[PDB]
């Protein structure tokens, strides 16, 4: 029983890079419907990182970065920074389910030399 949305997978990434998360749906959901990000930093509750595409929620460093077109959308985060390492989420509304849908999650990790 997956997640109906198809995100990249997790990826591991060095302090100060980029980094992009692809999610893909269909018309029923990200091709009409716009799409939130959820960040689950380690040992925290989710929480609603970017709302509508591409607005940033109260609190949101602007190292992060939103964008839809079509069926698919995606997450930037420029100057990664420690923090930064968390599960992150793609949710949308789907008209043919009638309810909100999600991708599987993508663990972003933040390199560190020990």
């Not at 100057?79 to 972003?108: H, I, M, P, R």
Request: hydrophobic share 35%; glycine share 10%; no cysteine.
């Amino acid at each position: 029983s997956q997640p109906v949305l198809t995100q990249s997978p997790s990826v591991s990434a060095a302090p100060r890079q980029r980094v992009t998360i692809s999610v893909s749906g269909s018309n029923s959901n990200i091709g009409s419907n716009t799409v939130n990000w959820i960040q689950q930093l380690p040992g925290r509750a989710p929480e609603l990182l970017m709302y509508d595409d591409d607005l940033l929620a109260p609190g949101v460093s602007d190292r992060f970065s939103g964008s839809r077109s079509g069926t698919s959308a995606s997450l930037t985060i420029s100057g990664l920074q420690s923090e930064d390492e968390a599960d992150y989420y793609a949710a949308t509304w789907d008209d043919s389910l009638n309810g909100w849908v999600f991708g599987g999650g993508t663990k972003v990790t933040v390199l560190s030399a020990h």
